[PDB]
């Protein structure tokens, strides 16, 4: 038995739509402190980790210290496709079902029998990155959305605290510089590094623009790219993307 | 022969589009009381009835009651020329079928659709001689949301009476859906003579709701225990478009 009420259903449904690009199935880890969603994609290239603190919700109650909720992503996302923009959404559970409840102009519920999703271990967060930058989620989205359709490999490099995104495609190449100098980066510190990542995985994450206004970007040579999407209630959407053959 | 002038063209097209959800040919019946069409999905489960009385028609005149048969081509021919503009329709019986004159309100001019149709004898209106226990009114928006909800989860819609509210459910295995309709959330009207639960082809519900597309008006729904469901809307500019759905006994 748990109950959680999100006011901004739209910007929640896009979080789940982003997870569904990487995972078929996942667990909601429900605790006093909030809900966590963690997992590695089938190709073992991407690990994601989403934390929605209790503060993120309006109503938030539990019947236990730890509740594991196994769900298919397609099944949940098909349901969230029926959201009605003035619908306040409620997540709800018990011994057998996860319930998604649309309430607003009138009340509607969708039931999914629980499924057995294998647990996830990182393990374990923290190496540090020789480079860190802060930027608007929209800026990142504007840039990745253009580049995403040009090629398969994203080259990222830093020089003298400026950040560079590059794609060399079969018909075009595009290289863009971001800096604090003209506020395209909010903050930017670290060493001159260089790495490359699969465009496809990185481009999947731009939908987070709809849930996150600010973001952090971490990386280095021959190490994963970390995308931290800052969510409004100290919540975060974390995406770790493995480097390519170096 | 028959001579008719229609004050609202946009509705005229809504009606023909509606009957399309049940048939691809259309028999128009011109009686002394007005125009009516009535057609049935040919496994008998869904019925489309169009009822347009004399008085809502700017001009209506007949020599004798007749019917006209618009084949699949003629319907496509009429619908190809559909528009939401404010306009006038002049419809007359001709020797080879029908002549339709469309004259908009602003810009004034008119194009003429010649229709090839066989004449016939008028059938009469057999409206299901049952009056249903459960009664309620909302709009097309509400029904559209429900049609797409149940479809996502099942092939069958089970509609149930509960106290002060209407309960709608679907899902045959484990994956399920429940909606609660009540007075002013969102219903403008609710009447419960006695308790009832019936079942219908969710995809015949969809097809019926689909036949509300071009109508602005509120929509009455009615049903009874293991009985058919009527879905009723009165066009802004006159007549009624009705659907019935035979239950799964
Ligand atoms: Ca694009």
Curated annotation (Swiss-Prot), chain A:
Keywords: DNA replication, DNA-binding
InterPro entries the record matches: DNA_clamp_sf (IPR046938), Pr_cel_nuc_antig (IPR000730), Pr_cel_nuc_antig_C (IPR022649), Pr_cel_nuc_antig_CS (IPR022659), Pr_cel_nuc_antig_N (IPR022648)
SUPFAM superfamilies: DNA clamp
CDD domains per UniProt: PCNA (cd00577)
Assembly and binders: Forms homodimers with PCNA1, which then recruit PCNA3; does not form homotrimers. The heterodimers interact with RfcS homotetramers. Heterotrimer which circularizes head-to-tail (head is at N-terminus, tail is at C-terminus) to form a toroid; DNA passes through its center. Replication factor C (RFC) is required to load the toroid on the DNA. This subunit interacts with DNA polymerase I (dpo1). The heterotrimer also interacts with flap endonuclease 1, DNA ligase and XPF via the other subunits.
HAMAP family for the chain: DNApol_clamp_arch (MF_00317)
Function, as annotated: One of the sliding clamp subunits that acts as a moving platform for DNA processing. Responsible for tethering the catalytic subunit of DNA polymerase to DNA during high-speed replication. Heterotrimer stimulates the Holliday junction resolvase Hjc. DNA polymerase I, DNA ligase and the flap endonuclease may be constitutively associated with the PCNA heterotrimer forming a scanning complex able to couple DNA synthesis and Okazaki fragment maturation.
Identification of the protein by name: DNA polymerase sliding clamp 2
Species this protein is from: Saccharolobus solfataricus (strain ATCC 35092 / DSM 1617 / JCM 11322 / P2) (Sulfolobus solfataricus)
Designated gene of the protein: pcn2
Swiss-Prot record, chain B:
GO MF annotation list: DNA binding; DNA polymerase processivity factor activity
A GO biological-process term: leading strand elongation
Record's keyword terms, sorted: DNA replication, DNA-binding
Pfam families documented for this protein: PCNA_N (PF00705)
Assembly information from the UniProt record: Forms heterodimers with PCNA2, which then recruit PCNA3; does not form homotrimers. The heterodimers interact with RfcS homotetramers. Heterotrimer which circularizes head-to-tail (head is at N-terminus, tail is at C-terminus) to form a toroid; DNA passes through its center. Replication factor C (RFC) is required to load the toroid on the DNA. Heterotrimer interacts, probably via this subunit, with flap endonuclease 1 (fen), Hjc, Dpo4, and XPF.
Recorded family membership: Belongs to the PCNA family.
Task performed by this protein: One of the sliding clamp subunits that acts as a moving platform for DNA processing. Responsible for tethering the catalytic subunit of DNA polymerase to DNA during high-speed replication. Heterotrimer stimulates the Holliday junction resolvase Hjc. DNA polymerase I, DNA ligase and the flap endonuclease may be constitutively associated with the PCNA heterotrimer forming a scanning complex able to couple DNA synthesis and Okazaki fragment maturation.
Full protein name: DNA polymerase sliding clamp 1
Organism expressing this protein natively: Saccharolobus solfataricus (strain ATCC 35092 / DSM 1617 / JCM 11322 / P2)
Name of the encoding gene: pcn1
